[PDB]
Amino acid sequence: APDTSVSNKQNFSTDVIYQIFTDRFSDGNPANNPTGAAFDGTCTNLRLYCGGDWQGIINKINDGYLTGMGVTAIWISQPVENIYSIINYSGVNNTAYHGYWARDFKKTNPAYGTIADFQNLIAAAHAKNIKVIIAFAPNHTSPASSDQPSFAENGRLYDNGTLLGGYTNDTQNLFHHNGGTDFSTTENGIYKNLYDLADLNHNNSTVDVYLKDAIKMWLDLGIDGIRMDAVKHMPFGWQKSFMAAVNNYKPVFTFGEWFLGVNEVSPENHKFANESGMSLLDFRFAQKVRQVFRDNTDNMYGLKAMLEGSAADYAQVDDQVTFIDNHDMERFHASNANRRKLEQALAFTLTSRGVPAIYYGTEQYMSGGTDPDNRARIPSFSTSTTAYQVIQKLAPLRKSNPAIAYGSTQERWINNDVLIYERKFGSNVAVVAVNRNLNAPASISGLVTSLPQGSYNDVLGGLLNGNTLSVGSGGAASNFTLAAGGTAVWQYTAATATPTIGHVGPMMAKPGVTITIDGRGFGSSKGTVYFGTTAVSGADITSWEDTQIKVKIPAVAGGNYNIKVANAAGTASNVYDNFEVLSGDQVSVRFVVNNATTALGQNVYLTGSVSELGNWDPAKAIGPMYNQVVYQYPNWYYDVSVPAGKTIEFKFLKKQGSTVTWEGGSNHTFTAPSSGTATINVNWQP
Numbered sequence: 158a159p160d161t162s163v164s165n166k167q168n169f170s171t172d173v174i175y176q177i178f179t180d181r182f183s184d185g186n187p188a189n190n191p192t193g194a195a196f197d198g199t200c201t202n203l204r205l206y207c208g209g210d211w212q213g214i215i216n217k218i219n220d221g222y223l224t225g226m227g228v229t230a231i232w233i234s235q236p237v238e239n240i241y242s243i244i245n246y247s248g249v250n251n252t253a254y255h256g257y258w259a260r261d262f263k264k265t266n267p268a269y270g271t272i273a274d275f276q277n278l279i280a281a282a283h284a285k286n287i288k289v290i291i292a293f294a295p296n297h298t299s300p301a302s303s304d305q306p307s308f309a310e311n312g313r314l315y316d317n318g319t320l321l322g323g324y325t326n327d328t329q330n331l332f333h334h335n336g337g338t339d340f341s342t343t344e345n346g347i348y349k350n351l352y353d354l355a356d357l358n359h360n361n362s363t364v365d366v367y368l369k370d371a372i373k374m375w376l377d378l379g380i381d382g383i384r385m386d387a388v389k390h391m392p393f394g395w396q397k398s399f400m401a402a403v404n405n406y407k408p409v410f411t412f413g414e415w416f417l418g419v420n421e422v423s424p425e426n427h428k429f430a431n432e433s434g435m436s437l438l439d440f441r442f443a444q445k446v447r448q449v450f451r452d453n454t455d456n457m458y459g460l461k462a463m464l465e466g467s468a469a470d471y472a473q474v475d476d477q478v479t480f481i482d483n484h485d486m487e488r489f490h491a492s493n494a495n496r497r498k499l500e501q502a503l504a505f506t507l508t509s510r511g512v513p514a515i516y517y518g519t520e521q522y523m524s525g526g527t528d529p530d531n532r533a534r535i536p537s538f539s540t541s542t543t544a545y546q547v548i549q550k551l552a553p554l555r556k557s558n559p560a561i562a563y564g565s566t567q568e569r570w571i572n573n574d575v576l577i578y579e580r581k582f583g584s585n586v587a588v589v590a591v592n593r594n595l596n597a598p599a600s601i602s603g604l605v606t607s608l609p610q611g612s613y614n615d616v617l618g619g620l621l622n623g624n625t626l627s628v629g630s631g632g633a634a635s636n637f638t639l640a641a642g643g644t645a646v647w648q649y650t651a652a653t654a655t656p657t658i659g660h661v662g663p664m665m666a667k668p669g670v671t672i673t674i675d676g677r678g679f680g681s682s683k684g685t686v687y688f689g690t691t692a693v694s695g696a697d698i699t700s701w702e703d704t705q706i707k708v709k710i711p712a713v714a715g716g717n718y719n720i721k722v723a724n725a726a727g728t729a730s731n732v733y734d735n736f737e738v739l740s741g742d743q744v745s746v747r748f749v750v751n752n753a754t755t756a757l758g759q760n761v762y763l764t765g766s767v768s769e770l771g772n773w774d775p776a777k778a779i780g781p782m783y784n785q786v787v788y789q790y791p792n793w794y795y796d797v798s799v800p801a802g803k804t805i806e807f808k809f810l811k812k813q814g815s816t817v818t819w820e821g822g823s824n825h826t827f828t829a830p831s832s833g834t835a836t837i838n839v840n841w842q843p
């Protein structure tokens with residue numbers, strides 16, 4: 158099958174996602190609607206259930222609303238059963254309409270539908286070439302109070318109907334009891350509760366095994382991707398072991414929600430996306446786009462800087478999920494704003510690197526403040542809005558032109574208000590011009606591109622006041638006027654002679670697992686696949702065609718490898734780096750080191766005899782470790798994904814910048830559990 162096939166669960170770069178807030182999209186089955194004080198059929202009270210369900214989504218898939226727009230993927234509110242409580246937060250009733258207050262990760266939220274309904278959704282979507290992503294929020298259960306067990310459902314967690322425990326009298330320590338986070342530090346936000354939500358303790362074996370078994374149930378139901386919620390608030394090491402469980406079973410595109418504020422560039426964020434096994438929602442992209450196209454707090458130079466910086470900071474920038482708004486922030490389109498601002502932001506996002514995700518209702522020019530005002534019921538299913546047409550015209554390009562899906566990004570023309578950028582992959586090219594100034598046109602002279610000589614029509618057909626482009630020899634474009642608010646897209650596609658890799662997924666797994674290599678120019682005959690210097694050919698290459706290769710990871714030592722392929726003739730492709738071969742199945746283990754004193758700025762890290770611990774390379778040591786919440790300085794702790802059942806030697810380090818101080822004595826040693834969790838507690842050796 159080609160890279161663009163709906164069956165490709167490992168690559169969403171050729172797709173356009175539609176963010177569906179289930180309760181607010183379409184009530185296709187009034188019979189499953191909640192009743193009484195928990196429901197408002199008019200959807201005036203945005204904190205109660207309005208009735209939106211999976212049958213509704215199926216209907217909108219079948220009547221062409223989404224397909225007519227060029228949407229090829231959707232994500233939905235967490236499908237698992239939520240609490241049924243109607244919580245009164247200071248005179249206002251609140252329900253779990255949003256799906257984030259889970260009580261049973263192995264059952265469905267009856268308001269959205271039954272397991273049968275979910276199966277029907279997966280089937281209907283796939284029949285229309287639409288992939289399905291589910292939100293999954295394993296960070297917590299629901300609102301709770303340990304002193305007041307009668308409040309809500311006391312954050313109780315059930316295992317397919319069987320009660321495991323609640324927040325009160327939690328002798329099993331299924332949850333954290335460290336108060337609520339104040340977001341002061343990453344550690345603080347991980348081991349303390351978000352709001353009043355009962356924080357799950359992933360170091361508890363029951364919780365660990367339960368959640369991994371739960372996600373596998375959904376994987377078996379045929380989901381195509383996972384949107385991990387609140388990933389900045391769960392142990393990064395545990396999450397890596399979670400992604401390993403997923404990838405070593407049935408790998409599907411996974412990305413997490415890690416909020417970044419305006420002007421926030423986070424090295425931790427980058428590292429997480431680069432080493433966790435999942436990518437992230439591109440807040441850096443979203444926030445900059447809002448600054449430039451919505452709030453006028455930065456110009457095109459800032460947009461360019463974001464594009465160049467992110468392409469260098471994220472190992473796989475093409476896996477970051479882009480957007481201009483979501484279910485938490487104010488909708489991009491302000492009531493009194495010119496609609497062209499939204500239309501340009503959409504065009505920009507749809508033609509830029511990554512995986513575009515459009516919040517439901519954006520195309521209907523919905524406006525709204527922060528939660529819950531940004532969650533109104535979609536007011537119309539009109540295909541006649543300009544925004545709907547913009548998406549309809551550009552979304553399909555991610556499938557037809559690989560430069561959009563996998564291409565590099567290069568600024569070709571720029572000033573305060575104008576940015577003309579080029580996407581290029583193999584012989585494929587796309588050039589996009591955007592003039593955010595709604596009052597002043599710009600004279601574009603001296604524009605040079607990789608487009609072959611010829612005349613190019615605006616893919617938007619002038620919808621956003623674009624124009625035709627005339628390209629002479631050398632890719633030089635004839636002088637033209639870019640209209641005020643003008644947005645144009647010019648593109649070129651052609652066969653690529655040389656094998657070219659545009660995407661690889663998953664990027665982390667143990668040997669034997671099948672990975673998907675997408676691109677162009679692979680040829681129809683099986684070639685060779687390289688993991689570092691190791692060559693793979695023949696039987697282990699399950700399938701091979703021009704745009705997609707399915708190949709099993711060879712039994713090489715755990716570590717980071719460059720991926721490369723060669724066609725049957727022996728011509729080598731470009732290198733796709735940062736592939737992590739795991740040393741085997743993974744388990745999450747908590748390491749605790751006692752009496753490790755340090756100077757301000759100096760932190761403790763973990764190093765060891767397996768790749769999961771950096772193979773004794775301080776530059777790849779695990780950390781910085783924590784020392785405030787679960788354990789207190791001079792004691793440090795950290796949760797780490799390590800190969801199950803392996804005997805591992807390790808030591809702790811104290812690092813100040815790249816300056817390292819090693820534990821003295823012999824290495825510490827332990828054998829990781831075969832499944833579940835474990836805690837290894839040792840003393841710092843001088």
Ligand SMILES: OC[C@H]1O[C@H](O[C@H]2[C@H](O)[C@@H](O)[C@@H](O[C@H]3[C@H](O)[C@@H](O)[C@@H](O[C@H]4[C@H](O)[C@@H](O)[C@@H](O[C@H]5[C@H](O)[C@@H](O)[C@@H](O[C@H]6[C@H](O)[C@@H](O)[C@@H](O[C@H]7[C@H](O)[C@@H](O)[C@H](O)O[C@@H]7CO)O[C@@H]6CO)O[C@@H]5CO)O[C@@H]4CO)O[C@@H]3CO)O[C@@H]2CO)[C@H](O)[C@@H](O)[C@@H]1O
Pocket residue numbers: 246251255257294301302303304305336337338350351352353354386387414484485528
């Ligand atoms: O021994 C003393 C005492 O200890 C214990 O009590 C402590 C608690 O255990 C501890 O958690 C802590 O609770 C307090 C909080 O720290 C504090 O912040 C405060 O919480 C308020 C909050 O400040 C209010 O704003 C309000 O919250 C609102 C939000 O503002 C709304 O936006 C909304 O939210 C929900 C969203 O609508 C949902 O979509 C979803 O959000 C998800 C996002 O959409 C998604 O993108 C993201 O990634 O993930 C999100 C989560 O899935 O869920 C949101 C949360 O439900 O609605 C909420 C609710 O109205 O209200 C909260 C609650 O009041 O006050 C807390 C109570 O004090 O501190 C306690 C005291 O130290 C013991 O439990 C106790 O018995 C002991 O006596």
Ligand SMILES: OC[C@H]1O[C@H](O[C@H]2[C@H](O)[C@@H](O)[C@@H](O[C@H]3[C@H](O)[C@@H](O)[C@@H](O[C@H]4[C@H](O)[C@@H](O)[C@H](O)O[C@@H]4CO)O[C@@H]3CO)O[C@@H]2CO)[C@H](O)[C@@H](O)[C@@H]1O
Pocket residue numbers: 341342343754755756757758759760784785790
């Ligand atoms: O995000 C919050 C902060 O995180 C990081 O801070 C960590 C430090 O870099 C790391 O050294 C350690 O800090 C411990 C000190 O090493 C240790 O000496 C002692 O600190 C003393 C201090 O020496 C003394 O001068 C002062 O009067 O009292 C301090 C005791 O509170 O304990 C420290 C731990 O409490 O761990 C820190 C994380 O907990 C970032 O480096 C920092 O910039 C962030 O603000």
Ligand SMILES: OC[C@H]1O[C@H](O[C@H]2[C@H](O)[C@@H](O)[C@@H](O[C@H]3[C@H](O)[C@@H](O)[C@@H](O[C@H]4[C@H](O)[C@@H](O)[C@H](O)O[C@@H]4CO)O[C@@H]3CO)O[C@@H]2CO)[C@H](O)[C@@H](O)[C@@H]1O
Pocket residue numbers: 773808819820821822824
């Ligand atoms: O990769 C080949 C070798 O791998 C393994 O060796 C690793 C060690 O097992 C591991 O402990 C660590 O070694 C560090 C020491 O633990 C640490 O004490 C220090 O050693 C200093 C020593 O303190 C000092 O007295 C002496 O003068 O210099 C030593 C350094 O040469 O740093 C060590 C790291 O440089 O990392 C080792 C890998 O680098 C296998 O155990 C070994 O058999 C293999 O040959």
Ligand SMILES: OC[C@H]1O[C@H](O[C@H]2[C@H](O)[C@@H](O)[C@@H](O)O[C@@H]2CO)[C@H](O)[C@@H](O)[C@@H]1O
Pocket residue numbers: 568569570571572602603604605
């Ligand atoms: O002609 C090559 C040149 O094209 C672009 O330069 C633009 C510049 O961005 C505009 O602001 C204005 O000064 O016109 C120039 C072309 O004459 C590229 O930005 C530049 O890197 C490239 O060399």
Ligand SMILES: [Ca+2]
Pocket residue numbers: 184185186187188189190208209210268
């Ligand atoms: Ca319904």
Ligand SMILES: [Ca+2]
Pocket residue numbers: 296346347348349356357390391392
């Ligand atoms: Ca947490």
Ligand SMILES: [Ca+2]
Pocket residue numbers: 471472473733734735
């Ligand atoms: Ca890369």
